[PDB]
Amino acid sequence: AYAQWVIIIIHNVGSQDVKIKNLKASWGKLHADGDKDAEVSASNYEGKIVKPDEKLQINASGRSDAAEGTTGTFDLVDPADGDKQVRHFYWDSPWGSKTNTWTVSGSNTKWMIEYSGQNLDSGALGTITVDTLKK
């Protein structure tokens, strides 16, 4: 249901481009901002380039009566370094279960990553920001 929603903000504080790839939502659908009825396909972001001081917002929400919550994974990769994997983010706002899971994986000394604003105990995940910087 729409009562389980997540908003993720990739904020490119650093000075170098970041590419978003492998944006897949196992549970739920990706919608626009301020209108949960405007579904957007993953192709709208796959390979998208985010420049310094540019915010990339992807809003996911469980469909009406989905009862499946909102879950998926996405990858941040370096436009250089042959699309090297910068970070692998997995988010899960289950409908059935109160506990949520937002996790980070991937090894790059090249990029520093900060993230905050996610709820893990009960309810929806919330709105999440991820700061990308190319050390």
């Binding site: 504080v13 000075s15 520093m112 900060e114 700061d131 910087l133 050390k135």
Partner: protein, 471 residues
């Protein structure tokens, strides 16, 4: 089959080549672009040093790309119902259908042809070469330079030199390639969009029944169809021909232009492989003075003070100690605890001249950072505090004309993005010429606000600042 040797050995043809190509005239590097000077900068030589090159080349490249995407969808829904009884019967039907087709076509074609018919290269001898055949500066240019350096005050000398170089030019071509080059470029773009839709909807009903012969019947029928066709098409064609050398009246006729490439009277300069600053052609004691006077900025090293607060950052932030002396300016915050750089313009403001420095103003929204008053200028640091447009130290912070600065390299500090600050450093170069100052300018990567301006990534050229000029 004549060559540059035959032209050079004939005074009439040699002088025609010199005159038609402005080989005695320098080039003015105005902000609108290079233009030849109308004043002769060097004395007409008795001969020219040349080599012969007649290796002609024709290269043609054609690239075509097409893309088509046709989408089709259709749906149909049907429902039929009947009820019955020994006295009445009823019936209904509903049939609906929808159809959709969409086609998008994109085409692109570009052709590029270049005909390169060289004749050779002509070289002039610069004084630094030390050879006996050397370009003599025209007596008028030398007299103008002397008169400029004769002015009483430094600003008068600088303005006289600016006028002199605006008339005579700032650079001189010491190596030029003679010949003819013809170029053609075609670009064609095409787009077509076709969209088609159809909707149908038929409804039907019926009722019938009877008793004791008192029978009856009824029927009803409603239908509805809608159609739409939308078609859009665009084409753009652009063709450009450029001729430089050869018979220009044969620009639209490639074969005749190529046939005309052996005629000396049409040979032109098709590229420049060496350019010498007009100041570099002067005698050394005058040369150094002219070079010094042409530097846009003065410079002064001053004491610095750590800016209190900012205790959370990994590196101490320093600023000019005391007030900036009248008429001077400072360039940003730095980690250099030893000294900081003050600058002052050398040329007053004048019509048609881009100033070396620009003023900074408090940001429009959600940003306490300064913004450049003029479009392409740059400043070397972020501001650690609130930028005061009208009060010190913010009133004297200045940005630089883009030609004053070269990209630098960052050097990050701090463990976390909330306190990650760069110490910009010069990019090292083998040539000790494009060298820049190691000001150690500070740039904080994550500015708290929003709408902040681009993160500084530049250092100041050493060639643009004059020290100890006693001014």
């Amino acid at each position: 089959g004549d060559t540059l040797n035959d032209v050079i050995q004939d005074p009439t043809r040699r002088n025609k080549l010199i005159n038609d190509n402005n080989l005695l005239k320098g080039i003015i590097m105005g902000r609108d672009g290079p233009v030849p000077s109308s004043r002769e900068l060097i004395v007409r030589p008795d001969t020219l040093r040349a080599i012969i090159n007649n290796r002609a080349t024709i290269e043609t490249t054609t690239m075509e790309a097409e893309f088509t995407e046709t989408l089709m969808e259709s749906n149909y829904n049907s429902a039929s119902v009947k009820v019955s009884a020994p006295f009445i019967t009823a019936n209904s039907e509903y049939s609906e259908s929808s159809s959709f087709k969409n086609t998008e076509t994109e085409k692109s074609m570009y052709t590029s042809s270049r005909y390169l018919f060289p004749q050779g290269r002509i070289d002039f001898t610069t004084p630094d070469s030390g050879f006996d055949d050397v370009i003599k500066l025209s007596p008028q240019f030398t007299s103008g330079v002397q008169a400029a350096l004769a002015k009483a005050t430094g600003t008068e000398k600088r303005e006289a030199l600016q006028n002199l170089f605006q008339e005579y030019g700032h650079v001189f071509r010491t190596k030029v390639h003679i010949g003819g080059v013809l170029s053609a470029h075609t670009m064609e773009t095409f787009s077509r969009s076709e969209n088609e839709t159809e909707v149908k909807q038929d409804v039907k009903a019926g009722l019938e029944g009877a008793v004791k012969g008192w029978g009856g019947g009824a029927t009803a029928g409603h239908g509805n169809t809608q159609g739409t066709i939308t078609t859009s098409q665009n084409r753009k064609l652009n063709v450009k021909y450029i001729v430089n050398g050869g018979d220009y009246t044969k620009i639209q006729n490639t074969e005749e232009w190529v046939a005309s490439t052996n005629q000396s009277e049409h040979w032109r300069v098709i590229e420049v492989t060496e350019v010498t600053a007009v100041a570099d052609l002067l005698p050394q004691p005058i040369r150094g003075q002219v070079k010094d006077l042409l530097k846009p900025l003065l410079g002064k090293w001053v004491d610095v003070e750590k800016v209190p607060g900012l205790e959370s950052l990994p590196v101490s932030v320093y600023r000019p100690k005391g007030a900036i002396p009248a008429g001077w300016f400072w360039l940003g915050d730095t980690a250099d605890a030893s000294k900081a750089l003050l600058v002052k313009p050398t040329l007053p403001a004048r019509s048609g001249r881009n100033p070396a420095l620009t003023s900074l103003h408090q940001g429009s929204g959600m940003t306490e950072q300064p913004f450049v008053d003029l479009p392409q200028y740059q400043y070397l640091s972020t501001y650690f505090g609130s930028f005061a447009h009208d009060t010190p130290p913010g009133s004297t912070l200045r940005g630089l004309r883009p030609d004053h600065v070269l990209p630098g390299r960052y050097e990050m500090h701090g463990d976390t993005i909330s306190t990650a600050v760069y110490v910009t450093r010069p990019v090292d170069v083998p040539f000790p010429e494009d060298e820049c100052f190691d000001l150690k300018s500070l740039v904080r990567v994550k500015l708290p606000g929003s709408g902040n301006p681009p993160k500084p990534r530049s250092a100041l050229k050493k060639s643009m600042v004059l020290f100890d000029s006693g001014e």
